[PDB]
Structure formats: structure tokens, C-alpha cells
Amino acid sequence: LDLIWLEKTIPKSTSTLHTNMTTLTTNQKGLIKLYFMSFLINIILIIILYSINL
Amino acid sequence: KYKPAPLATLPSTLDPAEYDVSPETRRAQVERLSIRARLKREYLLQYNDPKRVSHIEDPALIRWTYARSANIYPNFRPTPKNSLLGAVAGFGPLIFWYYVFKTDRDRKERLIQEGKLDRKFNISY
Amino acid sequence: LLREHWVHILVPAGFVFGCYLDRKDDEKLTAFRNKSMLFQRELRPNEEVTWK
Amino acid sequence: DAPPLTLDGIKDRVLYVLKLYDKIDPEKLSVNSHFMKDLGLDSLDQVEIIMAMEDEFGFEIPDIDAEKLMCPQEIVDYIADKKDVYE
Amino acid sequence: AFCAPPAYLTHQQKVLRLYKRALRHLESWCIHRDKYRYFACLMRARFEEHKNEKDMMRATQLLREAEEEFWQNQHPQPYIFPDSPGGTSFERYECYKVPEWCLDYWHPSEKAMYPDYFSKREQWKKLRMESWDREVKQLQEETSPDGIMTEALPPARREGDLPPLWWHIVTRPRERP
Amino acid sequence: DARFLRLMKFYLMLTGIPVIIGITLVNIFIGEAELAEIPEGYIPEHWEYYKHPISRWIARNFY
Amino acid sequence: ARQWQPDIEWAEQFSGAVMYPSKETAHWKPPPWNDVDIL
Amino acid sequence: WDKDVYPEPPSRTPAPSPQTSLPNPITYLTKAYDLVVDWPVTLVREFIERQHAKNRTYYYHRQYRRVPDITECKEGDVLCIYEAEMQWRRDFKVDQEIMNIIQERLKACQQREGENYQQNCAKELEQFTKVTKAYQDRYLDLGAYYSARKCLAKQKQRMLEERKAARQEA
Amino acid sequence: QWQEDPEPEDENVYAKNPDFHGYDSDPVVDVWNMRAVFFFGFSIVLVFGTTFVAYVPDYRMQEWARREAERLVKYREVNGLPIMESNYFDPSKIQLPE
Amino acid sequence: MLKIILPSLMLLPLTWLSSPKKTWTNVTSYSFLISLTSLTLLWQTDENYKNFSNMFSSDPLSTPLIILTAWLLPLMLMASQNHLKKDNNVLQKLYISMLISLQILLIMTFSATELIMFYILFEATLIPTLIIITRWGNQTERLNAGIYFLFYTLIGSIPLLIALILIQNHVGTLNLMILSFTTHTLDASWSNNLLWLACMMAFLIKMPLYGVHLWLPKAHVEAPIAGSMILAAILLKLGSYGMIRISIILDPLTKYMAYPFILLSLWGMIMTSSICLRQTDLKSLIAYSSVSHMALVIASIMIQTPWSFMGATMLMIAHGLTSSLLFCLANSNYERIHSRTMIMARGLQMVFPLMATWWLMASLANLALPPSINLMGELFITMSLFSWSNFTIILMGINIIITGMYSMYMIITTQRGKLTNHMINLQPSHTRELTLMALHMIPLILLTTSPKLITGLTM
Numbered sequence A: 001l002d003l004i005w006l007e008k009t010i011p012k013s014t015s016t017l018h019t020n021m022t023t024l025t026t027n028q029k030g031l032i033k034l035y036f037m038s039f040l041i042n043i044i045l046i047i048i049l050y051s052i053n054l
Numbered sequence B: 001k002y003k004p005a006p007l008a009t010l011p012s013t014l015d016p017a018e019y020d021v022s023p024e025t026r027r028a029q030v031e032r033l034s035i036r037a038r039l040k041r042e043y044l045l046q047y048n049d050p051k052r053v054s055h056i057e058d059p060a061l062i063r064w065t066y067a068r069s070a071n072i073y074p075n076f077r078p079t080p081k082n083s084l085l086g087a088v089a090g091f092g093p094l095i096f097w098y099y100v101f102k103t104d105r106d107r108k109e110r111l112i113q114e115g116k117l118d119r120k121f122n123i124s125y
Numbered sequence C: 001l002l003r004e005h006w007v008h009i010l011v012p013a014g015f016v017f018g019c020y021l022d023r024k025d026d027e028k029l030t031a032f033r034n035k036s037m038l039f040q041r042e043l044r045p046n047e048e049v050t051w052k
Numbered sequence D: 001d002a003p004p005l006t007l008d009g010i011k012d013r014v015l016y017v018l019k020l021y022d023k024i025d026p027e028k029l030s031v032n033s034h035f036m037k038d039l040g041l042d043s044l045d046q047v048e049i050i051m052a053m054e055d056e057f058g059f060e061i062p063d064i065d066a067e068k069l070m071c072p073q074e075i076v077d078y079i080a081d082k083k084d085v086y087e
Numbered sequence E: 001a002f003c004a005p006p007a008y009l010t011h012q013q014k015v016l017r018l019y020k021r022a023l024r025h026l027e028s029w030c031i032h033r034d035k036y037r038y039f040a041c042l043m044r045a046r047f048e049e050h051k052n053e054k055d056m057m058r059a060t061q062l063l064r065e066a067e068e069e070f071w072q073n074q075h076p077q078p079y080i081f082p083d084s085p086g087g088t089s090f091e092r093y094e095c096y097k098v099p100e101w102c103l104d105y106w107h108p109s110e111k112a113m114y115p116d117y118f119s120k121r122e123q124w125k126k127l128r129m130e131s132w133d134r135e136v137k138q139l140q141e142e143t144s145p146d147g148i149m150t151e152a153l154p155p156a157r158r159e160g161d162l163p164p165l166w167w168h169i170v171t172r173p174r175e176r177p
Numbered sequence F: 001d002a003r004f005l006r007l008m009k010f011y012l013m014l015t016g017i018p019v020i021i022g023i024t025l026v027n028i029f030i031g032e033a034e035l036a037e038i039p040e041g042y043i044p045e046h047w048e049y050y051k052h053p054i055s056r057w058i059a060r061n062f063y
Numbered sequence G: 001a002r003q004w005q006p007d008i009e010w011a012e013q014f015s016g017a018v019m020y021p022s023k024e025t026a027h028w029k030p031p032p033w034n035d036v037d038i039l
Numbered sequence H: 001w002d003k004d005v006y007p008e009p010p011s012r013t014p015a016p017s018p019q020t021s022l023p024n025p026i027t028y029l030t031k032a033y034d035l036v037v038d039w040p041v042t043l044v045r046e047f048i049e050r051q052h053a054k055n056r057t058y059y060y061h062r063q064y065r066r067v068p069d070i071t072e073c074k075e076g077d078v079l080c081i082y083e084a085e086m087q088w089r090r091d092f093k094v095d096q097e098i099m100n101i102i103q104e105r106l107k108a109c110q111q112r113e114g115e116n117y118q119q120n121c122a123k124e125l126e127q128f129t130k131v132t133k134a135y136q137d138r139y140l141d142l143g144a145y146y147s148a149r150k151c152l153a154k155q156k157q158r159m160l161e162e163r164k165a166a167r168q169e170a
Numbered sequence I: 001q002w003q004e005d006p007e008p009e010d011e012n013v014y015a016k017n018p019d020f021h022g023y024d025s026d027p028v029v030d031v032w033n034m035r036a037v038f039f040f041g042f043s044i045v046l047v048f049g050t051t052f053v054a055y056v057p058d059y060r061m062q063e064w065a066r067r068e069a070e071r072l073v074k075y076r077e078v079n080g081l082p083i084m085e086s087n088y089f090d091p092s093k094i095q096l097p098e
Numbered sequence J: 001m002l003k004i005i006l007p008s009l010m011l012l013p014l015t016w017l018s019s020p021k022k023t024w025t026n027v028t029s030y031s032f033l034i035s036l037t038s039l040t041l042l043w044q045t046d047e048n049y050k051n052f053s054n055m056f057s058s059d060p061l062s063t064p065l066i067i068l069t070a071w072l073l074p075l076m077l078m079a080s081q082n083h084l085k086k087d088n089n090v091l092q093k094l095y096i097s098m099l100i101s102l103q104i105l106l107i108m109t110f111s112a113t114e115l116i117m118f119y120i121l122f123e124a125t126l127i128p129t130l131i132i133i134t135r136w137g138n139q140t141e142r143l144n145a146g147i148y149f150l151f152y153t154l155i156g157s158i159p160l161l162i163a164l165i166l167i168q169n170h171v172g173t174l175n176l177m178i179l180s181f182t183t184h185t186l187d188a189s190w191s192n193n194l195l196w197l198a199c200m201m202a203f204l205i206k207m208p209l210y211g212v213h214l215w216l217p218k219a220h221v222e223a224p225i226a227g228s229m230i231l232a233a234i235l236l237k238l239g240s241y242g243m244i245r246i247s248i249i250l251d252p253l254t255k256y257m258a259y260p261f262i263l264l265s266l267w268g269m270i271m272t273s274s275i276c277l278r279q280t281d282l283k284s285l286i287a288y289s290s291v292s293h294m295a296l297v298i299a300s301i302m303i304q305t306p307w308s309f310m311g312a313t314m315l316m317i318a319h320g321l322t323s324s325l326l327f328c329l330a331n332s333n334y335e336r337i338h339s340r341t342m343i344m345a346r347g348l349q350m351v352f353p354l355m356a357t358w359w360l361m362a363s364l365a366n367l368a369l370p371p372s373i374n375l376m377g378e379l380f381i382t383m384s385l386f387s388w389s390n391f392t393i394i395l396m397g398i399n400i401i402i403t404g405m406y407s408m409y410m411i412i413t414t415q416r417g418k419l420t421n422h423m424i425n426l427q428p429s430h431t432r433e434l435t436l437m438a439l440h441m442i443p444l445i446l447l448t449t450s451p452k453l454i455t456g457l458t459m
């Protein structure tokens, strides 16, 4: 319960949750086309966020 | 017949393997002294040394502490018999006593509310 | 005498400053000087402040 | 309380006891005289000798250190060395 | 405690070390000396017979049934001497056996008294450093060809040399401090 | 482990005895006060409400 | 005593164009120190 | 001590009635204690008190004027309520040393009346409940953050009961 | 392997300065760093401090309350009032929800 | 209270301006006197607490600590004169100043009227501590330990920041005086049930609770002796002081929102006490001893009965002094031995006769021997806990038996048995080592004579 279970649950898990989240968000091609379309997606969603909450 | 238990183990005598003289056994039994003799002539050749101030290290003890407090989580793999047993130990009693203390505290409160608990000469808390 | 004893006077001086600053806190928080209920008395003869 | 032993009082007792063992002749016991090659005693009689000494001097001569108390003298320095008698 | 442990035990030393435990565990049940000196010369008889068995197999079958006869016919509270491991005075006086390398941190005042004591102590420390080289070299030049290696250490073998590794068998805190 | 005590048992005993001489001589010659009635308008000062003299010396001079 | 100052290996990790190297990200290599490339 | 705040019963002692020729080993000793232990001390003590009476000084007992109690104190007015939580926290102690005295006065009345404590000492224990049933009714449920507002509520939760029960009896 | 220093041994400060007090290597600083620490440490904090703390008068009013009780118990008992009445805030002051 | 503080600040100028050779004595001698000025706050002589000025106050709960915080700076600077005597003359003056700022900050935190003043100063103390642990930490793992000490406290801290700004909007001022004399009664909603957890959790984290205490064993292990003394004696108690002043508000919820923690702490007390029973690192065992004896405190600051609170105040001051004493003597063995292992170094009394007497008295303080404030403390928390539920004695009864066992085991396998054959010969005891101890225990003996001063706000 000390060491592994109380270190894998609270202290270590929070370590992993983030580590993994940075790995996906920061693995970027660096190509402009990809990045830009993401700008496209954003414009679309924000257009909607206004639209539906008109 | 003496019956060794995990405690009260089988004595040296009364132990069959002691009565084993197969070539191999007398080859290990003489090989193991060597390891010990070797290690023995590596302590005394470092403890009986004049001109020494540094700390004889006993690395066999350093391999023990590292194995016991800093080589544990690098060798943890969550299986069953480990997480079931790793939850019964942390939450089991912690939930047991809650229904031990809630039931008592609730019994007490009811009785106080209904007017039965004497609380006599109790002027402190 | 300031030759390595001007060092030794640094902290002692901090105490003095401390008390001063502290006794200039009282001077500020002096409303209810003597207007408190439990301790309101007529200034006895020759006393212009109950507590200074 | 009692007086400390000596390298000649730990030798007169060791010869004393042995001179009282019937098998060991009391006139051919000499301190440099081996128990098994010179006096004649067997292996089982070494255990019995040592044990007498362990009971004359009140301490236990460990097994491994006592599989060799052959000479009737080794017994006299080993006992003394174990009891710190520098004479 | 002095000599080194042999690797494996022979048949003999196992038999002859029962003759000790046995006879010594017969003097707990039989306390009075006479009863003992009787019930014991009868013990030797048991060991005396079956002495010349040449059939090893048999011999190791008398030994293995002797040590089980013994285990079940032993005394729970035998007579173990006062100063031996498991005894009543074992390691009692060890609270007074300081390890002698501690007189080296004494204040020059303390060592001021007790003057001749330290004059002889400084001689012995000169002996120790004066031979470490010839010793370790001996210990090594005489390392028998790699193979079986026992904890037995060599004697001197030359004048002036001191038995290799002798600083802690000599200079050992006195038993009764 | 002995030089320490001659120094600890000393510098306690250095300032300790002049205190003990002080508590004893004050408590002997000067003495604790006896309780009394506030005399119709005395309005006693802060120091007047404490028994032991040096315990009201500190009060009069510093608090 | 030598409070453990970091050795070369502790230092090594901080090299590489990404601290926590991913599956494909690790394949990358640190940017040129001069800020000029060989291509 | 005020013979009246710490009472103490009058003493009744059986008179000496020796019926043995032997000499009491106590009377002789006392005759000594009185000379070699008491007289010497007695002499010193007096000399103490005359040293005291020369510069005799006095110390009074602060008397605290009574300020308005929380029961009457504006809500939110931290000034008035502060002066009124102290007036109570003060009486939380004066009402506590009183209970210290009944703890004590009793203890003595069961050492002074052994084997009769069951009976002779019931003047107090009747009081130790007349005082404990009150201390329990004004200061007990409260947390460690005892405040006059909470005694005001501990009471007033029950003043309903001495008014709901009463009305209920009808 | 990289260049780095060989392990520094810890000196037996008790070999020189056999009067080492544990504060500093050179002897005079040591003496003057214990002559001022035992003094300011023990001689005028544990002694003058305990003297002052012992003489704090009637700390937290508990010397005052053992008298105020005595005159209240003196006054309440002689006048026949209950020694600790059972309601403190008078019932008259309270305006219970009607 | 600016004499306990301004003169303190001036210590920093003295550590820097002073000669490299004389820097140590000027600083230690002066803060001993700084402690003497601190003793003036003890002059209460009346119920009304002492509001020195708008921002600075000292009530019975803070006063017993401010004096301890001022007292340990001298001692901390005396226990770290050895290690840190191998530095470059500017690393020292940094360490000395770091220690000085801790009590400047800690003195103010314990003497602060506004709860957010507590928060800003509360969470600032991490900066000085993390530097002491990480910069001078001997082991390879202090970078890790520092991370654990910063994140566990920080993740707890931001919820408290939101909660205190929240109450300021709900009530209109975070002034502990007013908040006390004003009606702040939570309404047992689901949200309030969260507020309560927000305020208590940050305090519960640095007061190691069974669930989040892994930071303390790791931190004290590699921390230098001065950092380990500060963490055990003053740093952990910051969490307790906070729980006493913050639960004045959130008055109704803790009646039923405490069960979770209370049970976590009492079961935690048993398991933390027990793992002390087989832990090879001595500093490790003292740290878990600290977790268990602090688990008792969170179980008295939550039952909230007058006796609990001052049981808590008694134990916190007492255990603070005892723990340091244990951490200080552990260091003296560590410096000569050069290893934290408990199994090595057996028989020391044979070679260090007095340190062993200090070891014995420290252990008897560690376990509850009766003419000690340590026992009075536990006896009181034990009583109230019993009042909460008579069954509590079972769990607070397995802890007493275990606490006796590990406390004596530290004495039995470190200071008795046959001497270790020939570790690097153990140089005799310095007078500093022994005083640093004497300075810890002589106050423990003096406080036990008159326990009233450290009894808390409740009594």
C-alpha cells in the first residue's frame, strides 16, 4: 500500500497522465498545411459556437 | 517424527540432504566455501590494513537496501492477486471502521437525543 | 568605535527600530483610546492619556 | 572473585585430569604426547577427554576447534588463549 | 571459533560430534554424577559397537537413525555452559570490550597519564605497518593455484615476518574486560 | 563527553546562582504582597495587581 | 561527502529536440547550434 | 484561605489514654522534632515575615466592570460583540474555577471521612450534581471554538423545549 | 571518462586542534564560537528566559479566576443563590421565536 | 511583533556583511537573543489576545510556535556548521540566509491576522525549503524529492487560494478576528462540502495525512539536517496551525465531513507506525514516526473538542522538539558512519557514552513516558477520540504498542549490542553536537514543568 499502490495512484499517475498528453499535443509534423487546416477547423467550430448559442 | 514447519524447521541432522554425498553435492559444498573464502580474504585484506581510514563498504548491504527501497517500483507490474489485494488493504479496514465508528457515533447521538445517555459528572470533553 | 562593531550593531539596531515602528503603531490605533466600555474611566488628575 | 589462571596452573590441571583417565597411563602422559598416535586412545576417547577438560575449566571448546585438541598441550595453550592468560 | 569451517563434513566428524551432544544431553536427564557415569559408559557401548562397520551405506543408516533417536530423546533444557553461545553469560561482558582502535582519538591530556602504556602501543603499531607489505605479498605469493580456496591463512615461513593478517587475532579486546 | 559537562554544568551554574541568589533574597527580604481592597477611587496602576515584586517590576517598567 | 552533482548521463536526457520523446518524435534530432542547416 | 470558600470541619480528637507502662516512641520523637526541627525553622520564618512587614506592599484584584452581553449586541458590530465575547470567555473561566473548587472541596471530604464517605460526604456530592447539571447545560456540547453566540444558541435551542414540552403537557 | 576530482577524504579535525569543539578548524574561532554559544545559548536564554517566563504573572487569567470564584462562591453561598445557575444569558433577555 | 521580525531581517545583512571566519558566531549568537525577545510575547496576563497591529497578531496558538520558530534558527545554524563547512564562503552565507528567511517567513505566517497573508507567506516557505533540500541535498534523488515537496503542496495550495478569495466575497474580509466574530455558517450543500475540502486539503497535505504523506519520507531522506529539522519541527506544523484558524469558518460541515479524514488518519496512524518497525534507513523511520504522530493531530483538529485542540497544541510543540532531536542525532551518526543504514553502527554507547543518553531521552520523549508533555498530549487526544467513539481506543491502542516498539528498536539496534568491528573509526563527539541536542531537550524538560504555556487556544 505504501510505495507502489499509494505512489502509482496519486503521485505517479498524475505524472503519466500529463506526460502522455504532452506526447500527443506536441508530436507535430511542422508542415504548414496541417497546422493551417487546424485553423480551418477552429473557424468552423467558433462559427458554430456563435450560431447555436445565437 | 519431527515435522518441520515453516517455523521450527528441520534441523541439520534429521535432514536427508545433509546425508547426501553425491559427487555434485560435495562439489557444490566445496565450491561455496570458495566463494565465501574468497569473499572472506577480501574483507580481512581490507579491514586489517594499516594505513586505512576509508569506510569498508560492505556492498552486499548496499545491494540489499537498493533492492528494498529503490528497486521496487521499477519492478512493479499490476496483476491480479496484487490489485485486489492492493485494495482490500487500503480501503478494506478503512471502510470497516467507518461502519464501526458511524454506528457507534449514531447510537450515541440517538441515545443523547432521546434522553437516555447519562453524561453524569462529565463536565469535560 | 566603528571598526567591526558596526556589524555587531546591525541587529541590536533592528530591535530599536522595531520597537519604534511598533510604538508608532499604537499611536495610530488609538481610537477608542479610552472609549472602550470595560475600561472607560475619567482621566484621573494630571493624566491626559489612559494608555500610551 | 576467584584467582586468575596461569600457564602452569592450566597445565597441571590438564595433566591431572588425564592422569585420572584409566586408559591413559599416568607415567607416560607428557604434555608433548599425542592422544591418538602416542598414547593409544581412539577417536571416541578424544571427545571424552576434551569434555573432561571442558568440565574442569568450565567452558566449551567448540567442535571445530576441538576436533584438534590432540597433543596434551594444545589443550593447555588453547584453554589459556581462550582465557587470556599471558602468564 | 579460531579455526576455519571445513566445507563439507566427513562421516567421522558427524558421528564424533554426536558423541558430544549425546553424552552432554545425557547429563541433563541424568544429573547425579553416578547415574551419569553409569548411563554414559553404556552410551559409548552403543557407539563402540557399529564402529567397524565397513559398509558405508549401513554406517550412514546407523548415523541417520541415531540422530533421530537423539532428537526425540533430547532434554529441552540441557546443560549448556555459562559462557558459551546460548548460555547464561554469553556475550555478557561485551559491553566492556571496546575495539582498541578507539584509544587513537583520546585527548592529549588523557593519554598524558598512562604514559608508558602508549609508548608500547606505538611500538606495536610500528610492527603492524612494518609488515603489511611482506604479509599481503605472502598472502598472495602463496595463493595456491586457483581452485579450492579455504579460509585458512598461512603461517609466517620466514624470520621477522609476522603471521599474515595478525592484527585482529592478537590485539583482540580481552574477554573479561 | 566530560569537557562538555564542565562547560554546560558551568555556564548554567554561572548565571544560575546569581539568579537563585536573586529569587531567594527578593522573596526573603522584599516578599510577596498581601491582597487588599481598592480604596474608594485609588484606580490602581497596572503593576499594583500582581503579587511578586520582580513580577511587577517587569510589569511597571516594561508592559 | 560529495552531494551528487549530475553526471554526463543525467545531462544526456535534456538533449534531443523534445524532452519526453514520442514514438516518431524521437526520430527527430536536435536543432543545429549555429541555427543554420546542412541541406 | 477563606474558611468559608474552602471550608473545613471542626476537629474532634480522642484524648490520650495510655494503658501501658511502656514509653510511647512517638511522643519522645516529637519532643525532639519540636526542638531540633521546628524551633530552628520557626526562628528563621519569623525573621522572614518581619523583613516583609518593613516595606509592606499591597496588590489588588482587578474588578471588571460588566459590559453588555451578546444577548444585547448589534449583529455585525464587531466592536460590541468583541467586548461581549470576552466578557463571556472571562466568565467561562470564573464559572470553571468554581467547578474546580467543588472538584476539590469534595476530594477533601472523602479523605477526611473515610469509611463514611458513603454518607457523611453527601453534602457535597449533592452539590457536585447541582453544579454539574448546570455546567452541562451551558458549556458542554460546544466545540473548541466556544463563543457566547453558541451558548446563546445552546440555551435557546432548549428554551424551546422548556416551552414546547411545557406547552405539550398542556 | 570525464575529468572529475578524486574523492575528498574527511579530515580528522581532532588530529590537529586536539581541543576541537566542532565549530571551525582553526582553534581560536572554535573557542570563541563555543564561548559565545554556550553563553548566549544556555547562560542567558535557558536561565534568564526561564526566569522571565516563570514570573509572567497570572498567565491567561488563571490566577485571577481562582479568587473571583472564591468571592463568587463566598457571595453566592452566603446569599443563598445557586453556585452556578443553570442558564447564563438570562431568560428574560432572550426573545425566543414566539 | 516586529522585534521578533525586524531584528530577524537584519540577520541577513549580518550573514552577508560579516567576516567569512566570524559569520557563524555573529549569526548564531544574535538569533539566540532574537529568541529571548520572542519570549516577551508569552507575557499574556489576560484573556484578550494580543493584536500587535492590523496585520500582525499573536494568540495562544501562535505564540508557542513563534518562540519555537525563533529557537530552532539558532539550532539549525549549529547543526549545519559541519556539513556546509566544506563550502566556498558564499555558499555558506546563502545557506545561513536561507535558514534565516524560513523563520522570518514562518514567524510571520504563525503571527498573521489575514488568512491570505498566511497563504502568501505559507506557500513562500517552500522556496527557502526547496533550495535547502535540492541545492545541498547529498543523494542523487533530491531533485525528485524537491519535485514531490513542491507539487503536493502546490496542487493543494491553489484550491485554498480559490476558497479564501471565495469567502472574502461571501463575508467581505479574510481577517481572522472578524471572521471569528461574524456569522459564517456553511449550509451543508454539495458545494460547501467542496469548499470545506478546498480549505482543509492544502493544510492536510503538508500535515502528512495517510493518503498524501509520501512527500515527507522522500523529502527528509535526502534533505540536509537543517532542512529535515525545519520540515519536522516548523514546516509540518504550518498545516496544523492553518487547520485551527480556518475551521473557525466552515463550522457546521466538519461535524460530518471529517469522518473520511479521521478514519484515514487513525488507520494511517497504525500503518505508518508499523512500517517504522522494519525500515532500514533511520531517517526514514523518524519520518514515518513523524507521519503517525501527526496523524494523531489531524484527528484532534477534526474532532474539535477543547481537549483535542490543546492535546494537539501540546503534542505539536512537543513532537516538534523531539523529532528534531531525533533527526539531529541521526545526522551525527550519519556523518561519522557515512551511511543512513540502521543495521550498521551497532553498539555506539560503547563508544559514544553521552550521545546515547540523549538518544535514550529522545526515544522516551518519542514514546509516551508520563512526566513529559509528549504524553500529556497523547493522553488528551486519546481521551477526546474515546469520547467521539469508545472504539477509537482500539486503533489509538494499537499505535501506542507499536510506537513503543519502534522507538526502543531505534535505541536497541543503533545504541546497544556489540560494537561494529571497524567502520571508519568513529571520532569522538564534538561539543556542538552534544549542545545542539542539549538545546533541544533542556527546553523539553523546562516546558514539561509548566505545560500551561503551550496548551492551546481552547484552554
Ligand SMILES: CCCCCCCCCCCCCCCCCC(=O)OC[C@H](COP(=O)(O)OCCN)OC(=O)CCCCCCCCCCCCCCCCC
Binding pocket: B096, B098, B099, B100, B103, B104, B107, J270, J391, J394, J398
Ligand atoms: C483487540 C481488542 C478488541 C476489543 C474488542 C471490544 C469489543 C467491544 C464490544 C463490541 C460489540 C458490542 C458493542 C455494543 C455497544 C456498541 C453498539 C454499536 O453501536 O456498535 C455497532 C457496530 C456495527 O459495526 P458494523 O459491523 O460495521 O455494522 C455495519 C452495519 N452495516 O458493532 C461493532 O462495534 C462491531 C465491531 C465490534 C468490535 C470492534 C472492532 C474490534 C476489532 C479489533 C481489531 C484489532 C486489529 C485492528 C487492525 C490493526 C491490526 C491488524
